[PDB]
């Protein structure tokens, strides 16, 4: 299918209306970041020639 970016949300804009929150959600989200890799050392002489 042709993908859909998101659901349409026509914001009810007017020159004299505001939307004020009456409540809140404490949301905890995960962010995973790689820091290091496996430290590898190669004996060049042994690898090429044994």
């Amino acid at each position: 299918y042709t993908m859909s970016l998101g659901a349409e949300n026509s914001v009810a804009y007017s020159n004299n209306s505001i939307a004020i929150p009456i409540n809140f959600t404490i949301s905890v989200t995960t962010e995973i970041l790689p820091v290091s890799m496996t430290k590898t050392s190669v004996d060049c002489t042994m690898y090429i020639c044994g």
Binding site: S41, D43, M46, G50
Partner: protein, 50 residues
């Protein structure tokens, strides 16, 4: 099949037709002695960086 290694006793039970043993990386880490049908692990020698 030639190489250099430390030959220790192995707990791997080979099937009767199999002679050598390989790990994921296709390196010979297990072998069967031709004279006496026993399985030996081939641990690579302790190479290291000084």
């Amino acid at each position: 099949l030639t190489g250099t290694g430390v030959l220790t006793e192995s707990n791997k039970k080979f099937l009767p037709f199999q002679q050598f043993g390989r790990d994921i990386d296709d390196t010979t880490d297990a072998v069967r002695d031709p004279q006496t049908l026993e399985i030996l692990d081939i641990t690579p020698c302790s190479f290291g960086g000084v």
